[PDB]
Design a protein around this nucleic acid. Structure first.
Lengths: 87, 332, 332, 87
DNA sequence: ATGGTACCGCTTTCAA
DNA sequence: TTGAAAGCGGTACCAT
């Protein structure tokens, strides 16, 4: 269960928002993951995400796969648009 | 006269040893007993005494944070990442200002270490060999945030300050500038004299441009030291075409110092600050800067610490976060 | 078991009790005996365990600070004060961001209360009846820094916000302004709705000037909410001749958003900020603002708390520091 | 002992600097005081000194009576200038 | 000037 | 499951 987004964020995935997204993923049992420029990091890992160095523009792909990969990808979307991080 | 597990243990015809089990959510507790003692803990308004626990468990769920001056605009942000990730991971924090003073930095380390911290995040400006020795002596994990440690012995987390200033200097030459100046911070700090300066002198001899031993101004991150930094430079005969400030607070001082001399930005000169704080955006014109994920630097640091504190294996201790350049209006 | 007091006792060939006195500095020791143990403590690389002491002595020599956001130019500067005065009195700090979130505030209150803090310096924006009832049942003293508590029944340190905004408005009336506008922060917060705003309204009242609802713009502290606020007031038919912002952030938001629309400060519009922060002297033109001893507040707050912690009596639980108005260039 | 000054610091007897003074005064047995505009406060006290509001361009007196009532005044005086707080 | 020794509140085996 | 007891590192009152 996935979906691409176009980082609408002004600063990209960084600061608190980044923390917000990463945490949202940790809310679910599913194996939420994130892909970017040919590199997949756990979306539940503050380090993996913040190490990719995202920024306005570049599009990303938020993966997912678990007994709740559905509600998960939904939630991730919420916050993704709650902190103006792509769409 | 706080109520301990004993009172609760009495107020539930059970042993204090099982009251403990409930509190920490031990599985091996019959539902009747648990639910019975849970309403008891509330019926007495009980709150566990962490100190008591920490003596026994040898764990305090608290990390120590040694920061130079938490009043700054830079570090304060860093402190947010640090603080915020630690909460994520259920870890309180002990903040303490060192003011880049060594006797203090070391003294604090000892104090926190004494208060049995599960780990520490050190944000220093001059990590000597003596710090290393002290560091290697901590019984708990120590992570460095946005700091430059030559020895490369303690696990740090930051951006490449060397390649960072380089990218800038380049972009500046990659636009015509030939007489570019660098207003660094107290050279006494290994991050100025050995990382920021190098990336400046390197990107110059890398573009043939002769190193101008008078284009290197030494500020102190202050808004005023930057003001006086631009007044000294526009005094010499061979005055710079563009100037690069080690930070935003020195960069702003520069922009204004020029306008104070009738100079116009970016018309007359091209400035580029560093760190990319709220400051480099609340100015007219807006400050161009080498973006530094300050929050990410701290948040990552705290994350990495969480790992070490859990003995969990960690590939590579020294971490480097990606940096970039964001131009606003202080450049043509 | 790892290098404990008991180890030093045998090593220095004395008793736990004696070692403890030496460690603590009890004078009842033979200069020869102390020396013995000091060298043994040295030889064993011993560090006294503060957690243990904590359980034994019933005090952790640390205080919990519940601040909304440590990355705030103001809250950060305020924190420092509290911190410089904590070290002064052999005290440690447990910093934690609440983000004005009640849930998180009352929570951290407990976490610290469980962590056996000796005292607490709380900083908020909306101290409710609950907070109060919560504050009153603390096993330790609590002191509010730069906050507003309508129920005036908790020792706090701050300035008379209502009088500040007043003196600023009043100072503007006396300059010949007849249409003065107010740019506040979130009204949810009593410091805005109940203090600063009423100070503003009470000023025009005694100035016999009519209250123009349209001249009250409600920011959110954001340097951007300021720009957006200046715009809305200029959108009006009858524009104000001068505007007063409840914060420096929004003030620069006013200045710049105006300078951009063309207006030229101060010769076209009068502007006064509040808090007198680092931003003040870091804008162009210099921002005339109401001075608030932010540092002092947290400092006098921490000191007032050291008093309460030492069960010593104090004159007036609620304290208020003086506030002046530094006029700059943003004012004709 | 005694010695009047005229604050030069824009900030005056506040912030960090003011702290330094209150402390430098706490190191001597001699009760060091501070008078300003009419009222006198204990200079070995944070609340006292700060509750004064001693703004730039103001006069204040620094007394001291007891054991070290001399060397004390010298000290505070040396600090007053080492922190740009008036002569 | 020292040594002796109950705690301080809770975690953690070890047995029942 | 559940209880009993040994600590964890010190402090402080009490004797000597």
């Amino acid at each position: 269960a996935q979906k691409t987004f176009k980082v609408t964020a002004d600063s990209g995935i960084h600061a608190r928002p980044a923390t917000v997204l990463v945490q949202t993923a940790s809310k679910y049992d599913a194996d939420v993951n994130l892909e970017y420029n040919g590199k997949t990091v756990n979306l539940k890992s503050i380090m993996g995400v913040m190490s990719l160095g995202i920024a306005k523009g570049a599009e990303i792909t938020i993966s997912a796969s678990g007994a709740d990969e559905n509600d998960a990808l939904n939630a991730l979307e919420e916050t993704m648009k709650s902190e103006g991080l792509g769409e | 006269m706080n109520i301990t597990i004993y009172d609760v243990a009495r107020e539930a015809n059970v042993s204090m040893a099982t009251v403990s089990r409930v509190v920490n959510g031990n599985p091996n507790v019959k539902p009747t007993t648990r639910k019975k003692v849970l309403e008891a803990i509330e019926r007495l308004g009980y709150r566990p005494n962490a100190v008591a626990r920490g003596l026994a468990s040898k764990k305090t769920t608290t990390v120590g944070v040694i920061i130079p001056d938490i009043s700054s605009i830079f570090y304060s942000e860093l402190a947010r990442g640090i603080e915020d990730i630690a909460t994520m991971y259920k870890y309180n924090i002990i903040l303490s200002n060192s003011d880049q003073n060594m006797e203090k930095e070391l003294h604090l380390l000892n104090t926190m270490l004494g208060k049995q911290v599960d780990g520490i995040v050190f944000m220093g400006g001059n990590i000597t060999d003596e710090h290393v020795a002290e560091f290697k002596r901590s019984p708990v994990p120590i992570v460095l945030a946005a700091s430059v440690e030559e020895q490369e012995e303690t696990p740090s987390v930051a951006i490449d300050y060397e390649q960072a200033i380089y990218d800038a200097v380049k972009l500046l030459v990659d636009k015509g500038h030939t007489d570019i100046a660098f207003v660094s911070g107290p050279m006494a700090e290994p991050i100025n004299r050995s990382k920021k300066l190098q990336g400046y002198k390197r990107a110059l001899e890398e573009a043939n441009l002769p190193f101008n031993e008078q284009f290197v101004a030494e500020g102190d991150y202050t808004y005023d030291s930057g003001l006086e930094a631009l007044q000294h430079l526009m005094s010499l005969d061979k005055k710079p075409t563009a100037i690069l400030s080690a930070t935003d607070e020195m960069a702003l001082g520069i922009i204004h110092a020029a306008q104070d001399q009738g100079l116009s930005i970016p018309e007359d000169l091209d400035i580029i600050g560093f760190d990319n704080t709220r400051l480099s955006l609340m100015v007219r014109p807006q400050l161009s800067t080498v973006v530094q994920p300050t929050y990410d630097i701290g948040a990552v640091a705290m994350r990495l610490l969480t790992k070490l504190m859990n003995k969990e294996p960690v590939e590579e201790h020294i971490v480097e976060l990606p940096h970039r350049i964001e131009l606003r209006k202080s450049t043509k």
